[model samples]
Target: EEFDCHFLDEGFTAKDILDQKINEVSSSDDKDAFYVADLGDILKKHLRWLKALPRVTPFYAVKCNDSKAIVKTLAATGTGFDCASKTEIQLVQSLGVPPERIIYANPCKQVSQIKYAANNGVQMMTFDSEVELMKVARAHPKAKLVLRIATVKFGATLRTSRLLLERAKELNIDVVGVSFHVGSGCTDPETFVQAISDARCVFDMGAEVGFSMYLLDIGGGFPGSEDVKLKFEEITGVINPALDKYFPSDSGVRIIAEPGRYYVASAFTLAVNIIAKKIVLEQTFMYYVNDGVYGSFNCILYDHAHVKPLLQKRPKPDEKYYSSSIWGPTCDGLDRIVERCDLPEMHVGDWMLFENMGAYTVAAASTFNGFQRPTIYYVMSGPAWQLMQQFQ
Candidate 1:
């Protein structure tokens, strides 16, 4: 009993459905911007993750894209969630996701939120400092804690982790395992090699303190699209060997990763209708779409992403390209989406689509202007839907 989804027939692709949707919308006077997300793509990524890193269970980072249908789609796959806030945990639980499948992954938590997690039964959370351990011991006595090592990357350092492990022992708090993040949009595969190696060292330190460490949370930085700085398999290549060398299959250390971008980024395609057009400097064109920096294009500002648009309608056979700039609907001059790109002549009513928009876009978007966020339309292919049923 979740939101409605448009299920595709055997031959129809998401783009084909987008084509039909555009036709239906273009016929009407109201041509507001919208999104068409392919849930099947996310389902495939989950299977692909298992193929690449079979030992590690993925806790889908809820901060990436918290849309209900997206959350529901992944929940059905029996995947766990990495919730950063109280509201995120509520959303995951509201969908009937059991408390055990959710991790309050944020290392720092407000006192109220910590109690909320205790009350809700989400016990596995990460802690980076001594103070956090003290807070947890008092708030959630039986909480399963994963020590987050530092961040300019947030987890505790090897020595600091040793210090915290002993400190937790003093507080009589339970330290379950370790976790580390290589930041988002990672360019180096070796970072994971180093992070995993560090986690093993911490596991040894925990053993020295008489704690039986079981979980190891290798936090996210996995690429979503092929245009990324590093390929997904390339990261996994370094990771698998690193894990075997350190925490092997026989080691009995449970591995998990909080993959935000890897699962959802490419599944969503945003279609913004060109509400206004400007002929700039006599040679350049300025196309303004209804959604901008405050809307879906917030990814450009918040995530430091560079996006290019594909026209909904095809160009002419001899289409000549021109210097074009894309702007968001907001009045702020900084509301620009793309500064310069080569695009054929386009009109005000035409629609522009941006792919690989699922991560870090809608999750952080704000309705600053009177203009609203685009209505998201979720879709799944019939075959994929059948697979989802079995996967659950």
Candidate 2:
């Protein structure tokens, strides 16, 4: 199907809808900001992901698109939260997520934050080193502990995870279980073996400390897709085997996985306007979209992933274009959408949408270049309704 061909409303493509919303917001007397949301649809998506991975309860990371509306949707879905800070803690709490339901998973904790977490009902947290354990013992002795088994690579290397079983034992802290990540976009299924091996090492270490480690939280990076079928068995094949190898018997410790981008990254698409088109002296073409790294696609530069944009408004193609570059309106040279790639000739004032933008994009957004971010709207197969309030 053509990108902008009729799909929903008569003669009203996504671009048309975007234009209407833009006009309405610009002409509004109230300068207060808002984003259109389908509360029931959002709740359903959260529920679907939770159901897909029944073994793992979603500790929805507050860092990912923490709109109050979204948080409330999660709360209604009965999804737990993974809070990194005291503010994140409070934000979910505002939605009435009980303290026991939220995990202060931030391995490194400040003195005041620890106190706040304990007082607020965050019973579980992660601690890697003995120093952190000492702090936990002093500030929140009752805090449930999980030893963060460090993944070797694929992320910023710092905050060592080692000897947690023995260290927590020495510190007289409750070391409930172990956790680790194979890293983001990890392709090789064998990598799960490495992570589980890492967990097993800690498991053995935990056993030596006289602690029957029950929880095995394989930290968030179960590969979803890169244009391929990701069967549940293939994805969990490595994980299940590792579980058997490590804990042959069920051992009564609940198995959990912390999957961040895997769950919600594909749930939304970001649309940007082709505000301007230009041709340089070198005969190269560029398209400056309305949004940029300042608002979204901030991970375009640092991460080696390719989240290239496609012309969402292109209904028909007369001529195929090649060797095109897309840029965001920012002074920084690194704020590029896609450097060069094949695309059909697109006109200015068109719309481009990128998939898998529901992850770190929102969390990393900034106010640079005074560009207002696009409002998030929801779409689904169920219900026609209106929001009772604004989305965060």
Candidate 3:
């Protein structure tokens, strides 16, 4: 078939319920597309969830989207900021958040970045090895350090915690804490149990080395996608209680989280114009969308299939469902979205908006193949709009 029917009726989905609102749609030929954002609603919901965890502080990873509105909302919530690069550090600085309120959390830092952090008053940065410690000591001697331990090898008998502390001491740097990541969207409760035990090992080793390490930086791996239904509360139910029992409150160690996807993943969406669509009697469907993977969906190609927002309104969803393949605008054969999956119907000149595209989806975007990048905006539903209006 040359073309198919595309519907945008009331029943048609305006947004993916589980996705970030990254795209704004318009039938007009002009480029101006307004994406409504709700900073307050997101802030309220995120804070309510974050505050529940015992001794945990949410640090908005600035690379996720540095919109002033997003930054203002996060700042107002009293959460800290995690900056990896100099530009990210500058972005946080522009938001009126003092240096002390931010953490230069990138474990791998160049000498220039280390000096930049020290010059700009960002005293906290992460280190994974003794060489990193030596560099930090020479470049930013007063900087506080968090020794980053890479996760344990799966099914391996040998562990990691002890060796890391030995490295930290050998470097003779002032170690403040330990940090590790539970893989993104990890489900097993035992994985966290092992992580906590690893952290405890580091703590014990630090004590043995005459270093007072208190901060336990659980690097962000909390699930924040539609692939899993586990809430932060349920996951914390297992991990936080363990910290209280072993680390203790009087330890004065602040527990920190570096959540990238969890905080911003569902807050945005992407709208792609359907250049072509077709259906066959055997139940095969094809869709050609306007934006290629390089423009805004590179995560699909480079990041190993990071979560993408579901395509909003297609042709049919009933028993007439058809196996489908969606391709991007790029001429490259590798620019496919999904292959051989059941989906609703669609047509030419129709728009397919993808949701939950806020996190790594956009920041990692490139201008390859001469494709333009998507614009980002925020939405708010109640008093938040009023607050945003005041700022405007």
Most lDDT-accurate candidate: 1
In candidate 2, what are the lDDT values of residues 82-118, reduced to their tens digit? 7889999998897787887787777888989999998
Q: List RMSD in Å for every model shown.
A: 1.2, 6.2, 6.7
Q: Could you tell me how far off, in angstroms, the CA of residue 95 lies in candidate 3 after the best superposition?
A: 1.0
Candidate 3 has a TM-score of 0.83
Q: What is the C-alpha lDDT of each candidate?
A: 0.89, 0.64, 0.67
- Lowest summed lDDT over 10 consecutive residues: which window, candidate 1? 148-157
| Models ranked on lDDT | 1, 3, 2
Per-residue accuracy of model 1 over 1-392 as CA lDDT, tens digit each: 56669889889887787788889876657788888899999999999998999999999999999999988989999899999899999999999999999999999999899999999999999999888888999899899999886536466788899899999998888889999998875777888888888888888999998999999899988989887767999889999999999999887889999999999989988888898988967589999998989988888878989897998897788888899999998888899999999999899899998989899998888888788878888899988899899988
The collision pairs in model 1 are 148-155, 148-156, 149-154, 149-155, 149-156, 150-153, 150-154, 150-155, 150-156, 151-154
All candidates' TM-scores? 0.97, 0.81, 0.83
What clash count does candidate 3 reach? 22
